[PDB]
Design the sequence.
């Protein structure tokens, strides 16, 4: 019952209005070599969305350090967006530094498959991870009642960038995979003789010709990804509500 | 470029062949009062998929504890399913206990929008979380080169179940949200009169009339959810590859 | 070019969400035997719109006295609507007492033809005047750059009601028409025998058989109407910006 | 429902016969650097129409002073037009100086959406305000039983011309707005940086970053606009029915 | 019903993924001057299919000696294909030396009409014999429950190459036809003058003008064809299940 | 390409004219509890087709013994069929006992997909093996220049009937399969528990859980199947063109 | 109903296979400056067709004297055609010397409208008379149960060649017409002036302006045409079956 | 290029206007148990047509003795028909006793395929022979320039009637066939058994099993048919133009 962009496709080319100005996607980021996370939320001045924006805002320099920009999206106007950002800066003490797309009318939402059956009016919490070639790498659709785990989005982009750069695939649960730890997977042979050569070379640890891996990620890349997960798992000492 | 079922919709009724036999979905689970997680993977005997199956299998009791069943899917035949399961039991030491649908041909995959642009032949790594009423609550689409974080799937279903029984929306990163920690959000008033009565009642902690929260989840519930994130953030003591 | 409801047609039956609750139009007002003025504005937190809401809000008793209710509309959500009404009340000292419809995808706006070419995203400043039977009696489309004259909406309503209750047409600029002042027009004869009988009747003041009038409105109806124009023409004693 | 040209669109191009000749719209007026107000009325030798034509003829010079021309329209033929103008001139003593379109087949009225459900055969009292670029700036649809307030069409064109030349939006009830009086609105910033800069400059009177205004209009322009309202509110010292 | 390519058409051009690598069909073999037999099986790790691969494997050299390559096809992935090859080599002791196309999704199978009504998901046991021009010369469709007689496929290939080169048609059951034995048939005259001339040449053994034959095939070519049948008819002494 | 009926479908219902009378297929044979082999030939009085009629006529008793009726088909008329059958009887000494459908116009041939690309005018040499329920069980398309090996049609029929009554699949080259000889195959388990069950029962000879077999066919059934192959391999003792 | 080529149209350009080789109609004959009679018969080895072939073969020289060739047509193959010609030459003693098109599939028959109700499989007995410009001059459709009168086809071609060369129309039953004998008709005048000039020219015998005739055909041409009817009317002195 | 009814179809049901009154056709004749010959001519007052109508009129008795009625057809009106029949009676001395259809407009003509390429306005010389069941049995299309041989039409109806009643096919130019004279053909056997029974019934003279014949027509029938041919061949001793 809905149409969406797909992984592996180029992000739909579109000019959008954001509270930082009009920008062209995915070009604005591709031209800078940036990946970007475009995420949507149902409405400004709604609570789960406010928690998610504060959580992205607090992790903004983690994204910037990976070369990833952030961009939000909802059916509200840019006026609402600014007003909501001022409310947030004023009452929660957190400045939201990235743009939010305003698409009253839902043109962008439809194009991205963000209006689901829970609401005909507001988008769900989708998240698109797009690489520096403009290519959709991952898509997540959370519902209106459940905020996202923003550290898993950091883990996803960190792991995709690493995989791309090291030409490896990433095991489930990685930095902490139960079979190979922080090891990374060598893409499986796709021919018989490549399989045979890989087993002949003895270059990797392997469980079978289609299951070879090594540990080429730097200790800093592994620690950084593990740090996102430890952050997700750690209860903050001091809530910003108290502070407010 | 791809059509998908949507959150809030009933899972597409269908009969599917799994390596445990034919089952009708969502009925097989709805009749039992159970939720289910249907997840797909590109291919039997490929490594990220094997790490993911092991991760789901080792967390199977956690899904059972929540009344959630797991069912996998790929375009391989039930015979490859069975031989791949044997190989995992034999070389990694873990038995996969749940069914895998086999859809050579991609009939099921196409109905669920699991074939993306990354591969014309194998599905991406999608995940549908479906409640005991047959309704899709969340959908995730990870790519072929990156395993999922199974603990977040546990966190999602645990949080959706809590929000459903307590009538509360769940903040970003719950139960470690940075604004209200493990608090849960009272869905926002949608009318002025409702906004005013809520501020007047004084029955919730509040940042504004649209941001009210309280802490109705039991310590057990919060800690179970935080325990999934802690496990994810924890480096394994010993790797299954070593003991194998 | 756009499609719109027409004068003489029953307002399009629709359920809408406003910041006072879901109501069905035109039923909600017809059921109360109330005429209503539905008006739209491009966006909450935008200045001309704010001046129009305060102007409508300050003339609300004048619409109540007629039996007319007011309802606004923009593509913003109800949450923005309530925050915006809180802002006006806090900074301008005027409470907006009527509902505002939230139409974030333009559904209502498309039905009413409120999306013009000045903006693909925000509605123009439309006004539909609807009588207690649900019929569209007048439609005005002002642009985004120009605020309405709310006293001319009162004059319209007052005159339509008077014309309906006295079976009279209302001359240009009534009750200060330059030919007949506060006189009201007798619907012209449509047959030759009616035209003849009207002339032999000697009952109205008349310029020709198709141009007869009298003065059946009461001094109250006449001075009420003129009072709206006198208020429009008057320089405000004190501006709301000074005590703001 | 019916279809209508929209604010912001070029006025439909079409040749039209008027009782001054054939002309091409909007070209005739665009060619002359003129804005024009095209208005319709249901029928020649009908009383409310005759009052409106008299009211427009009386204010014609006020329209010309603004660089604005008037053109009528009804389904009558040019012969009826000329006969009706003679009749007005003879019995009311007013010469109607501007052209009226004769549109016997409803071709023009259907391009303009002027046939509503109140009559299948005669147009409502529609008003297009078209600027010198041939672009529709405002559309009012009065019904057949209610004559228009011609001073409000002069205020709208004067306000539109002023806001275009001063780059300002016009508040409700200008020049007598209740919040800022004859103050004009600076169109709102649409990005955070613009908002910040607007407020940092301290160059405008302001209630919020999206609500700034100043008083750039000439004392003569404001007085003229107020004069249209004072005239509208003032009862004529003597009625034309009295000499006639 | 279903759509199939046809004898005498060019084998459908297609790039195909095999367990030896991506190859382009007709072309890969056409470019080397080789014929190829493309055959399909419903599923790796299924018993009839295994017997067929082992039977093709055992006759590999017979097809290589005729210049004919072998290529398999199923809807399984290349990873299943290679594990199944490994399983056959390991438990039967036979190495399958030719490629198998992996067609999950059934794209190649739809194009060759290999999906019949006996299974909506797996291919029947098709067989396409394609000459060095890339032309389909014979198509056989066995069902899932019945293994092929591979020696009849070598007889088909051998006979087709012999007839192409001797410019002869081949009688039923050649080289053991009950009427003419290892005789080969001269294509019948299609005109009266040719029939008459043929009958006058006295050059062929003949039963009638449209039934002439001779014995152009060499004794080694005859014996080779007969050796395939003798092999098909001989009970193997020593079954590979016992040996294994 | 061309359309064909598929294995597993009910043979297309049709009334056909044969040189034995009009009959309705498949009903005519189903109502007698008989399977039938329907084969086509390009043209009466052409040599390969003559050799194929004589070979089928010679095996007629072998086909009837299997419960199988033979039916031919070509685009010729029934009068050609009868003259050709007299010619065969008179010059070769063999009486053809089964009917031949006459399909001038090629209506039956287009339904069966018997018109391929090497002749726009005559059918290829197709073979449909139809069981006693009217179901197409195998389809073979031989080209015009190569006659069929009729003993392999007998082997096919025989093995299909044996597999149907013993509920067994037939290995490649049966009764002389190189791995299991005249054993037959138990259809593989399709579920994990069915596989474990099979393997735990100890009831079949086995190479793996999906490769079990046994020797359930009678000595006479196996020897009959082997006789067809011995015959195909044996050079006839006296050629029929000799006595003739 | 069925569709046919029409008199006055060029015969359908087509390439056809005849038992004398392939030819292109109408070109093969137009190139030679010959007319041709194409006629069809239902089926070789059928009695009425055999008698028609014989009658056409016995009159072959009469067609060649006129520069007319003959080609026949049925849906049988060139092989049937040749075997049937042999039968006729051997049992009746008559060699059929002209080509027969073989049209299995009925492609030529359908373009010529030769498949009528009566038989869905064999053509009717049609005849096209086609002149040396390739134009269809006459068409006759006899049925399957009634042989044609070949002498009337000779009369038709003779009469047409005569009317073409002498520019005359031919009366009914010519050369034995009961009103003007072997007289030939001048095409009637089509204007009043032409009528008047014709009658006053005194150049033709005449019954009225529209019925003028003379006798320009040579006694030879008249006698030759009457001789075909005398032959038709003549009882044969010896029957071919007696010496046959 | 043209659509015509076919032999073996029921003549198209149609109400036609004739100069004898309106009748309904196939019915009006079928009602009487009569066959009919409907023939067309291009135009009244045209010469070949007149000679054909005279030729039919002189043979009317012969057709009536056979139970055959005649009906003409052209695009002229019934007034032209009656006038032309008067001219014929008056100038030729022959009364035309049968109806002629008038189809100005050509509705009947298009339905019978009578408008060929030779003329877009007047029909060709069509002849339909329709039996007492209303079935079209023979169709002839002669062109404008060539009148028909009416004795051949008698010969066809007599032969078709004899063939129907004696259950025989009629040889080429019967009563004078060169092979069998006035012999009539037995419809060929269509099955092998029927052929063999034929050859053993010994009831008929025979050249082969598909060529048997009888002499069942009485001498009177044979002679009446031969008389139609003798009359065609005979030049009339005195021409009607003579006494005209």
Sequence:
């Amino acid at each position: 019952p809905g149409s969406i962009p797909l992984i592996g496709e180029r992000f739909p080319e579109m000019e959008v209005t954001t509270d930082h100005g009009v920008i062209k996607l995915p070009d604005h980021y591709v031209s800078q070599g940036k990946w970007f996370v475009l995420f949507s939320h149902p409405a400004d001045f709604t609570p789960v969305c406010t928690t998610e924006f504060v959580s992205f805002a607090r992790r903004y320099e983690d994204f910037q350090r990976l070369g990833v920009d952030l961009i939000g999206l909802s059916v509200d106007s840019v006026f609402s967006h600014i007003k909501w950002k001022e409310w947030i800066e004023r009452h929660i003490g957190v400045r939201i530094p990235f743009p939010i797309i305003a698409d009253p009318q839902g043109t962008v939402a439809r194009r991205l498959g963000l209006l689901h059956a829970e609401s005909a009016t507001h988008t769900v919490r989708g998240v698109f991870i797009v690489d520096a070639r403009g290519v959709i790498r991952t898509m997540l659709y959370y519902p209106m009642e459940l905020g996202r785990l923003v550290d898993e989005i950091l883990r996803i982009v960190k792991a995709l960038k690493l995989g791309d750069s090291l030409k490896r695939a990433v095991p489930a649960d990685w930095p902490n995979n139960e079979i190979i730890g922080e090891g990374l997977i060598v893409p499986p042979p796709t021919t018989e003789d490549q399989a045979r050569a890989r087993m002949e070379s003895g270059q990797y640890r392997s469980l079978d010709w289609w299951f070879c891996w090594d540990t080429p990620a730097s200790r800093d890349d592994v620690e950084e990804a593990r740090r996102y997960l430890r952050r997700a798992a750690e209860k903050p000492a001091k809530l910003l509500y108290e502070e407010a």
Notes: Residues 90 and 244 of chain A are 9 Å apart (CA to CA). Helices of chain A lie at 27-30, 47-66, 78-91, 107-112, 150-166, 192-201, 219-233, 240-243. The longest strand of chain A covers residues 68-74. The first helix of chain A runs from residue 27 to 30.
